[PDB]
A paper describes a structure:
We found that the masitinib pyridine ring mimics a pyrimidine base in the nucleoside binding site, while the rest of the molecule extends to a cavity only available in the ‘open’ conformation of [name]. The binding mode of imatinib was similar to the one observed for masitinib; however, the pyridine ring in this case was slightly displaced from the nucleoside binding site, as the angle of the pyrimidine moiety (meta) prevents the pyridine ring reaching the bottom of the cavity and the pyridine ring extends to the sugar moiety cavity. For both molecules, interactions with [name] mainly involve non-polar interactions, without direct polar interactions. The binding of these compounds also released the monophosphorylated substrate (2′-deoxycytidine-5′-monophosphate), observed in the ‘closed’ [name] crystal and still present in the other nucleoside binding site subunit, elucidating at the same time its mechanism of action.
In the present work, we identified [name] ([name]) as the target responsible for the sensitisation of various cancer cell lines to gemcitabine, using reverse-proteomics. [name] is a key enzyme in the nucleoside salvage pathway and recycles bases and nucleosides originating from the degradation of RNA and DNA to achieve the biosynthesis of deoxyribonucleotides, which are required for DNA replication and repair. Previous work has revealed that [name] can adopt several distinct conformations, which are a function of the nature of the nucleoside and nucleotide bound.
Numbering used by the authors:
A (entry chain B): 20 to 64, 77 to 260
B (entry chain A): 20 to 60, 72 to 260
Write the structure that this text describes.
């Protein structure tokens, strides 16, 4: 089977930018991008933007978004496992975010932020729990690449990307998710219902400096982490 | 193997009355109660109550949240029943109080048409339903459907006979809109579904208009009949 690697990080940290660098560095190295486009134009597998609806009235749409987001990821991630990489010697599938960061970082943060009531949040937890243990050892990650950046850098990279929905985001929101990231992957004190995660290796890279051209060091680091996997 | 039959019908038609009768008749006969119907009385049941109270309170906000949890519940209950006591029983039949297809094609459909679910809610629901079902519940495919036919008028009476105070509000107009949905689907079979096999699933239509609580003999004799013909 394929080594499943997850690239984690805050909003605008540099996930797609870095994951594209690695994507290009090898055949049998493939990527599973977060389906942000499906959330942008809700068309069935013209249509509304559920990423916008959530940022505009989070108290109204957080649960509906958080649900479609996770489901769209699950779908995509599975769909890739079946991809050409199946018939390819020594393969590596690089996932842009994971089912673990949807719940324990974003959805968790919204419930805490009072944008999901106890009921909304319980339903989501039971759904995520039940739904995830229906694959077994299928979507289990082999390793995690944490792309570390200040919530300050993120706010600036949000303002470079220039996606309308998120131009309203305050430092405080990024600051909240940052802390959640640090507790999950750096200090590793964020307990999850996924007991295997406890023994999963994490490579933490400080992607604060504009690595777009100065990325050789970052790539040397991934290649070493992957050998040890 | 276990034969899957679903009991379909409008509100207060007599589904829960019939699934109880059938349950008592055979050791080989097991029944799967509607999650909604239960909640119309342990976190899976605690959430149920909460969401159903909000559902009545403001259907414009909780239609998606409800039709979602109520359907995941159904899949979870039915997948659990398949691995139950019937597994090693000589000639087993599993009766389902309403199906995963009625949730979507009658109720969830009606709520999108009521404007209680917007287009974006509706797109996501249809997509969530298409996926959940094609992955997890591919076994929960039906062997047959027993339609419990009753005039919207009959149901309106049996809603009072029931007495659930929230239910006492339900207009005849609402029951008439749901009636025509059932009739188009199961009786005329003009209702188009995303599930291709439902074009050739056998349907026994029973006229539950007369009180069957005490004269259920013939009704069961026609079921016994239908079961052999699968
Ligand atoms: C369980 C429930 C409670 C209330 C409602 N609907 C309403 O209560 C309601 C109220 C007003 C309108 C019309 N009006 C349109 C315009 N907008 C702005 C307001 C509403 C429509 C529906 C649906 C449901 N949904 C539902 N879904 C599945 C099953 C059942 C159900 C209920 C009882 C017994 N058996 C099954 N019920
Ligand atoms: O070294 C870097 C990495 C990222 N970015 C910019 O930061 C924004 C967000 O990047 P990305 O989509 O990769 O972030 P993600 O949210 O996927 O982590 C984009 O405008 C990038 O060009 C940048 O200027 N320099
Ligand atoms: O032959 C019958 C069947 C049902 N009922 C009454 O109909 C009401 C609702 O029945 P049920 O719960 O079976 O309906 P469902 O909503 O499940 O279709 C209850 O008060 C029953 O006692 C009745 O009077 N006679
Ligand atoms: N469960 C999730 C997943 C993603 N997002 C948002 C954050 C971004 O605005 C976008 C995904 O792109 P990014 O790579 O910038 O995080 O969706 C969210 O709020 N909740
Ligand atoms: Mg992105």
């Amino acid at each position: 089977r394929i080594k499943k690697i997850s690239i984690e990080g805050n909003i605008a940290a540099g996930k797609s930018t870095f994951v594209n660098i690695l994507k290009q560095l090898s055949e049998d190295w493939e990527v599973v991008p977060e389906p942000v486009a499906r959330w942008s134009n809700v068309q069935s597998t013209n249509g509304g933007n559920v990423l916008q609806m959530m940022y505009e009235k989070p108290e109204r749409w957080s649960f509906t978004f958080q649900t479609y987001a996770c489901l769209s990821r699950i779908r995509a991630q599975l769909a890739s496992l079946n991809g050409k990489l199946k018939d390819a010697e020594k393969p590596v599938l690089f996932f842009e975010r994971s089912v673990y960061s949807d719940r324990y970082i974003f959805a968790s943060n919204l419930y805490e932020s009072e944008c999901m009531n106890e009921t909304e949040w319980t339903i989501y937890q039971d759904w995520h729990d039940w739904m995830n243990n229906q694959f077994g050892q299928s979507l289990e990650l082999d390793g995690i690449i944490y792309l570390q950046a200040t919530p300050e850098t993120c706010l600036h990279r949000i303002y470079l990307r220039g996606r309308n929905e998120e131009q309203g985001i305050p430092l405080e929101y990024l600051e909240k998710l940052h802390y959640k990231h640090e507790s999950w992957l750096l200090h590793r004190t964020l307990k999850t219902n996924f007991d295997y995660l406890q023994e999963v290796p994490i490579l933490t890279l400080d992607v604060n400096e504009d690595f777009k051209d100065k990325y050789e060091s970052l790539v040397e680091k991934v290649k070493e982490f992957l050998s040890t996997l």
